[PDB]
């Protein structure tokens, strides 16, 4: 007798989400030999060991371990989950044709300095409803927030950084779309984002040229991480400043200027 282990990759029972988001997974609440045959038609036994590297014979087939820059990292705990479970966010799901975010309290008057960082911290989420609520709240606040988005930028850089460092392609695409909507929200916000290129760009440079005559029939989703990186880089250069190009080049050597 025996037991079978099904291949659950890309299925409803895929454990990748569970193993990459520890806080997730909760419910709605909470022998002889030759001794005279010395012949020249035999070659020495190859080493093929990690210690063989830089030896006189050579490393051989041994290779250094991968650094794992593309390794899909674990999601760090997000304050969005705890705040939502506590009830701080006046956010609900308005079920219907396409789900949307319903705001319980007046939304034009809520403290952006207190709420928007939580929403940007929530982009790292991986299960409903946390990820959807965070991303859609980000979209709404950035689309129609006003001039109060600009002062919050320095405390918004860290959540964007942490979402980018997760190396999850879906999270990268989501935070890229949210970043584009952030950039097209005001006038000076791009110039304010320029000095913080040092903390937002490395993941974009890493994922610049990653792609998922054959027509890409799935394109309304816009999950192409490399295309999103290129588009957001061009949009940053457009709605940046005079030093935006040089600041972008300082971190993405393969970038090509658009305004010039």
């Amino acid at each position: 007798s025996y037991e079978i282990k099904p291949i659950v990759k890309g299925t409803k029972r895929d454990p990748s989400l569970l193993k990459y988001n520890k806080a997730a997974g909760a419910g709605p609440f909470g022998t002889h030999g030759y001794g005279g045959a010395c012949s020249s038609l035999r070659k020495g036994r190859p080493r093929d060991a990690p210690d063989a590297a830089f030896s006189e014979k050579g490393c051989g087939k041994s290779a250094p371990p991968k650094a794992g820059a593309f390794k899909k990292r674990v999601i760090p705990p997000t304050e969005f989950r705890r705040a939502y479970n506590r009830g701080d966010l006046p956010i609900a799901i308005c079920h219907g044709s396409r789900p949307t975010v319903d705001w319980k309290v007046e939304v034009e008057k809520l403290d952006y300095h207190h709420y928007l960082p939580i929403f940007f911290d929530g982009i790292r989420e991986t299960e409903e409803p946390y990820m959807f609520l965070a991303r859609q709240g980000c979209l709404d606040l950035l689309e129609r927030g006003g001039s109060k988005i600009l002062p919050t930028i320095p405390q918004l850089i860290i959540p964007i950084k942490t979402a980018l460092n997760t190396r999850h392609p879906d999270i990268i695409s989501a935070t890229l779309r949210i970043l584009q909507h952030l950039i097209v929200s005001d006038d000076l916000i791009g110039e304010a984002l320029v000095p913080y290129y040092r903390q937002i760009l490395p993941v974009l440079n890493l994922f610049k040229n990653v792609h998922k005559d054959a027509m890409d029939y799935g394109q309304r989703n816009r999950d192409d991480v490399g295309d999103l990186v290129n588009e957001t880089l061009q949009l940053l250069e457009q709605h940046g400043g005079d030093d935006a190009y040089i600041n972008i080049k300082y971190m993405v050597p393969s970038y090509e200027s658009c305004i010039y």
């Binding site: 990690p50 490393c59 371990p65 794992g68 820059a69 040092r198 903390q199 490395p202």
Partner: protein, 429 residues
């Protein structure tokens, strides 16, 4: 192409004192400052490190830097500490307190003005200032903090001139300071932006060299810094003496640094052998190359087997033929191409200077921009995060004027540099 040097902190002062001893040996300069070399070549290019006085005294172009005056007294209490000009000894009344914030903002600012003044005087005296050299430790108070403030100000004043640092990064196995990760994290982000090239020196690897390789029983910091002095002289041997394949510091920087952030290098010296095995060893280019690329010969704690070489540099010294020194690189590349990056063909830069370090048939210094430096950057990164989760030993830094978010910014710089090194380690064609 004059080079002006600075020694920050106790570690920096000791390393610089031994380095100036070695350089005076190579140029035939006694502690009295008079030249007694037997050849023209030593005096031909002595102006790169030494400035001649009215009486012929060759004063080193060095500035000493430490808040503690006791070690400033001790460093010139040595025989070769009489070389330095008395006015270059700049010190404060109160020590650094082994605090990066105290050495960078409170006591650093109140003292950095005189250091910039003397450094500017030296730069003006230079006919053509090639660059600035710094020797310090990332774990100390004033060696790290005040050193980074100094490098920032010299970067601001002289942007195009070459910037060099020799940083003794502390590590837990030789952890003789509980705030070593704090200081290293607060200094690494300054070093990334303000340093053209930053050589890394490590105490575990130095002791590994002194025990496993040199076999001598009990060498102290003197013999420990002898190796760093030999390396720091072999970096600019090509500047100080002519050779078949000349090189300078921007030579190395251009042929060694692929991207602006990636300028942290591992060091190695050859030959290195015990006294009893000196006469049993046959010196040759093959032996030199094997000691260069041998993992245990590296003087920083990061195994090259765990990473890939962005670039390597071979500063050979001694009368040697050229196709064999190039053929050693041929062999290394060909039979370790798995450990070398494909999209950078011929990762090894080579240069030859005929004049060898005194007392050796033939020698070589190795510069290594391997991607495994990310491992030792991380091994300080998790330590910093461990102390920063509880934010212990942080009231000392915050009461000296530092801001809370600066530590997170330093974490950001560490993680970004590590991510860049990982990306370019696993990047394909």
């Amino acid at each position: 192409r004059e080079i002006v040097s600075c020694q920050a902190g106790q570690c920096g002062n000791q390393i610089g004192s031994k380095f100036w001893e070695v350089i005076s040996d190579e140029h035939g300069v006694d502690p009295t400052g008079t030249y007694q070399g037997d050849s023209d070549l030593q005096l031909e290019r002595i102006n790169v490190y030494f400035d001649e006085s009215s009486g012929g005294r060759y004063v080193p172009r060095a500035v000493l830097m430490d808040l503690e005056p006791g070690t400033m007294d001790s460093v010139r209490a040595g025989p070769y500490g009489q070389l330095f000009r008395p006015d270059n000894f700049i010190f404060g009344q109160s020590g650094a307190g082994n605090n990066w914030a105290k050495g960078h903002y409170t006591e650093g600012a109140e003292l950095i003005d005189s250091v910039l003044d003397v450094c500017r005087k030296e730069a003006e005296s230079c006919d053509c200032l090639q660059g600035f050299q710094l020797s310090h430790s990332l774990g100390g108070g004033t060696g790290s903090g005040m050193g980074t403030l100094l490098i920032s100000k010299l970067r601001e004043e002289y942007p195009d001139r070459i910037m060099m640092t020799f940083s003794v990064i502390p590590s837990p196995r030789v952890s003789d300071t509980v705030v070593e990760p704090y200081n290293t994290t607060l200094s690494v982000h300054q070093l990334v932006e303000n340093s053209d090239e930053s050589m890394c020196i490590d105490n575990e690897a130095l002791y590994d060299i002194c025990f496993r390789t040199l076999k001598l029983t009990t060498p102290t910091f003197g013999d420990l810094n002898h190796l760093v002095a030999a390396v720091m002289s072999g970096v600019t041997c090509c500047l100080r003496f002519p050779g078949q394949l000349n090189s300078d510091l921007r030579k190395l920087a251009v042929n060694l640094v692929p991207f602006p952030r990636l300028h942290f290098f591992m060091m190695g010296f050859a030959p290195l052998t015990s006294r009893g095995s000196q006469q049993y060893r046959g010196l040759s280019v093959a032996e030199l190359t094997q000691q260069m690329f041998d993992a245990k010969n590296m003087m920083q704690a990061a195994d090259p087997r765990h990473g890939r070489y962005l670039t390597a540099s071979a500063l050979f010294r001694g009368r040697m033929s050229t196709k064999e020194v190039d053929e050693q690189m041929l062999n290394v590349q060909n039979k370790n191409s798995s450990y070398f990056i494909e999209w950078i063909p011929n990762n090894i830069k080579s240069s030859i200077c005929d004049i060898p370090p005194k007392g050796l048939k033939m020698s070589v210094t190795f510069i290594g921009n391997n991607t495994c430096i990310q491992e030792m950057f991380r091994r300080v990164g998790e330590q910093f995060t461990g102390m920063f989760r509880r934010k212990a030993f942080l009231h000392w830094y915050t009461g000296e004027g530092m801001d809370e978010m600066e530590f997170t910014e330093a974490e950001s710089n560490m993680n970004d540099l590590v991510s860049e090194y990982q990306q370019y380690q696993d990047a394909t064609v």
